[PDB]
Design a protein around this nucleic acid. Structure first.
Ligand SMILES: [Mg+2]
Ligand SMILES: [Zn+2]
Lengths: 515, 139, 315
RNA sequence: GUGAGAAAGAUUUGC
RNA sequence: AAAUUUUACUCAC
């Protein structure tokens, strides 16, 4: 049915592939590809372009963002039980906390400042040294990245050490800054469609457009290329340590450690490789493994191929193609004049995950589709009504609801089928505000968030420290007594007000209610 | 023994960032195991029951959007709408009124939304989310 | 204050260690020839190769579950329960369980399923798959069809597993009109019983798809759909246009979603003026990438859809 | 069902 | 038995 569309269609309406296959096969395949590329028989991993164009950032103060060093996402933490390395799957928050406990540092910035200012690799930083940190930071765990549309065989992703993440944060921040300085396309605040529009403007002069993908992108980006880029932008010893850890990385597949001296393990340094391409020439507009360029004659095309080869961006003969009236970048398809190509495009369907999350996500998807002109508004209204009916048919049963209030949606035992326009204009019952894409979170979302907080990897016995005064800086240090006092004061004030728990706050509702 | 000394062994003071990160229960992830989780123990059913009689009768009534202008289909462009965050005094007052501190802190920061729009008006004014085709204006 | 470009006292030693470590060798420069994108003949060749290599099943095993069987609710429940009893499924706590001891550790036979005439019960089938794999062991009924999800558990003697966990697979059993080798009879009731072995992620992925919304969104701006035969060939005389719905149902049942890869490559084909020689064609060969009857059929019918588009509405 | 331990348990699965 | 190294763990309450 995707084949009989008048316009462009990627077939994104259904969900991506998934399965319970173990990640061992994919990780082994990736490692073998990296080894073969290292041998110098399949693709090119030797960088020959000139990066002297890139500005040096070696004099910038070493700034660390603590917010992005703590997360609920997974990571690998290395311990030594008796005499062997054991890799544990934890959350980035727990891994960073364990790192700071071992090193005995207040914050990650203090830890990096201490690491950079030691007399020798054997000098102790708490209960560890820089040598031990480097040895532990080369260990990776393998998992499977599923639901990637168009990849029936799932790829392998890798969880890294907290120290590796700490160094990569600085490196990638500075690489992103250099990219933003190199061109206006790489600005921090830019959407995919905006980037595609800029690309369309930048390639208008020439006749033919080469829409290219890079094959084996991660396997062909060597530690040498990363070190070259980092020295070009002036990353100091941080870049050297990162390159050393990357060259000596090991992956735990099932129950065995496999050494992978080539590649960068599935998009650890996207910005650095983008720089590896961008600092040698200005004829490309690349975003990791996807790029677009323009040319007029076969000589220019051969020059393009030479530039791609010299920067270790091996062309994908399977997917890369040449067009004259089309422009594909960031999955966004545009005409040569920058207007959106007619058709569904990347429009993605909304699966059934919760009675109200499905409706909210459908409303967001339809708002995006109608704003960009993918479909007219009446079609979106019909589709929203159809989705409400489907959700009613799936969820209106005693398992999920025992209510019969009229204002409720039909999927929760009610009798209200809200119009899409009525929902978008906030002309509805307050219960429907959560279904608005800009409205509060839904009941399902809160329930699932709490249950996730209760999981084995994320469960903790610590007294929660939430509902904090906005004036308190999150960089302030606190003790157990301090958190106890803060919680007691907040609880006392809330009880005095008469509220058992804090009232949820919504920016849009608050602003609208104001006079 | 206290949990502070167990989770932060060897350290007596930690940043509020780390401590808050250790207890996070407001991050939602869209996953395949959603209906199963919602059915388990009738958690969604109980949550709906609780919302209908504890959380619903506290939401202020929001006025509906009225102003709209004539629009015509045009070339794809980017609409930049800058929404400023709460001022300091506003945040203090909202906190003293019993509102969630984390949400107020998140609303402190000014932000800008970049959205692709394929509709334009005579005076080139911004539009609300999903209502560019109808002409509802931010004003 | 420390700066990012700060040079540590151990910089030289780490640089020397990096120097002593292995380095990559320059690779071979590829030769790229740009040609026109593939024509109808190449897609026909790919379809013929799939057909020759794998062949066809005598019946549409689980796709046939998309059409109503000729039994009422009570008859469907009785047939399913008696089939479960006939297969020696353990009965415990009012629910069915399938026990396994030894595995051949070889892939199941793969062929291409013929297309049923239509799939009126697609929404109901997907909802039932979701519900049954969420709560398994007993027959679940819809307005027009029934399903039975049976946990597949190891047999270990006395302390063998009693309750399924998050990693336990399910055998989904459905009913369709008789007339194939999977016929089953009991007390004058006849039905073809077809099974599908799914891991929990697979069943969750299958059950969460919205058939009706997807069909409407596709229908928004699509061209006229031609009638097709049981094998996905253009047949303007004896073909049916409802089989397209069946194809959509197949794409919903295939948890590998190879049709999405075919769709992306076909989009590249339609937007391309010139492609690489002998390499763009290989993007349509995805048999090595998938494994199983349902994924194979989905790939075959995606290629058939591309062929039909190139035939009836050439671009 | 709850807690802990297996390179490990479902927010799994990273940038 | 099947979409076949997957459908498997232990302890205590
Ligand atoms: Mg591309
Ligand atoms: Zn049969």
């Amino acid at each position: 049915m995707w084949a009989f569309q008048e316009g462009v269609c990627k077939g994104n309406l259904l969900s991506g592939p998934t399965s319970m296959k173990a990640p061992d096969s994919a990780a082994r395949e990736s490692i073998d590809r990296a080894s073969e590329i290292m041998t110098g028989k399949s693709y090119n991993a030797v960088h020959t372009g000139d990066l002297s164009k890139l500005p040096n950032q070696g004099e910038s103060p070493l700034r660390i963002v603590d917010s992005d060093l703590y997360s609920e996402r997974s990571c690998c933490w290395v311990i030594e039980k008796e005499g062997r390395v054991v890799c544990k799957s934890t959350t980035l928050t727990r891994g960073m906390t364990s790192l700071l406990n071992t090193t005995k540092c207040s914050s990650p910035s203090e830890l990096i400042c201490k690491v950079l200012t030691v007399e020798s690799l054997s000098e102790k930083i708490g209960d560890t040294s820089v040598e031990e940190l480097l040895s532990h930071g080369r260990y990776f765990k393998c998992a499977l990245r599923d639901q990637e549309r168009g990849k029936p065989k799932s790829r392998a992703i890798f969880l890294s050490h907290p120290f590796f993440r700490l160094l990569s944060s600085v490196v990638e921040t500075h690489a992103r800054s250099v990219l933003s300085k190199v061109s206006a396309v790489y600005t921090a605040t830019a959407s995919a469609e905006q980037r595609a529009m800029m690309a369309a403007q930048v390639v208008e002069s020439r006749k033919h457009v080469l829409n290219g993908d890079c094959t084996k992108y991660n396997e062909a980006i060597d530690a040498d290329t990363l070190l070259k880029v980092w020295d070009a932008i002036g990353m100091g010893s941080i870049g050297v340590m990162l390159a050393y850890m990357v060259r000596r990385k090991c992956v735990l597949i099932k129950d065995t450690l496999v050494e992978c001296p080539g590649g960068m393990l599935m998009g650890m340094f996207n910005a650095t490789a983008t720089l590896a391409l961008q600092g040698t020439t200005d004829r490309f507009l690349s975003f990791s493994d996807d790029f677009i360029t323009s040319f007029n004659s076969p000589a220019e095309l051969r020059e393009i191929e030479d530039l791609l080869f010299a920067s270790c961006h091996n062309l994908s003969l399977k997917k890369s193609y040449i067009s004259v009236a089309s422009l594909e970048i960031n999955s966004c398809t545009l005409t040569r004049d920058g207007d959106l190509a007619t058709g569904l495009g990347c429009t993605a369907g909304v699966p059934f995950r919760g009675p109200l999350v499905t409706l909210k996500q459908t409303a967001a998807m339809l708002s995006g589709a109608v704003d960009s002109g993918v479909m007219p508004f009446h079609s979106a209204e019909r589709l929203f009504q159809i989705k409400q009916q489907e959700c009613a048919y799936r969820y209106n049963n005693p398992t999920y609801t025992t209510r019969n209030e009229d204002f409720l949606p039909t999927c929760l035992g009610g009798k209200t089928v809200i119009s899409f326009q009525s929902l978008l204009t906030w002309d509805c019952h307050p219960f429907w505000y959560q279904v608005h894409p800009d409205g509060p979170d839904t009941i399902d979302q809160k329930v699932l968030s709490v249950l996730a907080s209760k999981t084995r990897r994320r469960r903790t016995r610590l007294e929660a420290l939430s509902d904090l005064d906005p004036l308190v800086p999150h960089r302030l240090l606190v003790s157990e007594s301090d958190v106890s006092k803060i919680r007691a004061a907040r609880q006392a004030h809330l009880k005095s007000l008469g509220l058992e728990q804090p009232t949820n706050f919504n920016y849009a509702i608050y602003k609208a209610v104001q006079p | 023994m206290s949990q502070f000394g167990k989770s932060f062994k060897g350290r007596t003071e930690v940043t509020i960032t780390e401590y808050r990160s250790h207890t996070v229960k407001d991050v939602h992830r869209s996953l395949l195991t959603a209906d199963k989780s919602l059915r388990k123990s009738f958690c969604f059913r109980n949550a709906l029951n609780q919302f209908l009689d504890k959380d619903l009768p506290l939401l202020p009534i929001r006025p509906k959007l009225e102003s709209r202008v004539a629009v015509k289909k045009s070339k794809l462009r980017s609409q930049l709408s800058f929404r400023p965050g709460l001022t300091q005094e506003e945040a203090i007052d909202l906190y003293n009124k019993g509102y969630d501190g984390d949400s107020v802190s998140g609303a402190l920061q000014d932000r800008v939304v970049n959205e692709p729009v394929a509709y334009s008006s005579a005076d080139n004014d911004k539009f609300h989310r999903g209502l560019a085709a109808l002409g509802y204006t931010l004003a | 204050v420390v700066k990012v470009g700060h040079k540590a006292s151990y910089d030289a030693e780490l640089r020397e260690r990096l120097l002593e470590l292995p380095h990559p060798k320059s690779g071979p420069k590829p030769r790229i020839e740009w040609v026109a994108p593939p024509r109808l003949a190449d897609i026909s060749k790919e379809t013929a190769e799939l057909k020759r290599q794998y062949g066809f099943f005598e019946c549409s095993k689980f796709l046939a579950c998309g059409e109503e069987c000729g039994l009422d609710q009570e008859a469907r429940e009785l047939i399913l329960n008696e089939y479960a009893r006939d297969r020696e499924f353990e009965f415990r706590n009012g629910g069915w369980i399938q026990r396994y001891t030894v595995a051949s550790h070889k892939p199941a036979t793969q062929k291409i399923l013929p297309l049923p005439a239509s799939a009126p019960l697609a929404r109901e089938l997907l909802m039932l798959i979701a519900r049954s794999t969420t709560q398994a062991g007993k027959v679940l009924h819809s307005d027009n069809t029934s399903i039975l999800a049976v946990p597949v558990m190891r047999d270990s003697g006395k302390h063998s597993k009693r309750r399924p966990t998050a990693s336990t697979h399910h055998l989904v059993v459905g009913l369709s009109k008789p007339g194939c080798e999977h016929d089953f009879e009991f007390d004058g009731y006849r039905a073809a019983v077809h099974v599908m072995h799914l891991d929990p992620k697979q069943s969750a992925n299958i059950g969460e798809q919205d058939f009706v919304s997807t069909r409407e969104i596709y229908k928004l701006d699509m061209l006229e759909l031609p009638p097709i035969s049981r094998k996905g060939d253009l047949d303007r005389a004896s073909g049916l246009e409802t089989r397209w719905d069946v194809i959509l149902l197949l794409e919903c049942l295939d948890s590998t979603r190879v049709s999405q890869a075919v769709a992306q490559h076909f989009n590249r084909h339609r937007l391309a003026l010139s492609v690489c020689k002998d390499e763009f064609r290989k993007g349509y060969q995805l048999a090595s990438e998938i494994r199983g009857t349902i994924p194979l059929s989905s790939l075959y019918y995606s290629l058939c859809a591309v062929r039909l588009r190139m035939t009836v509405h050439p671009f």
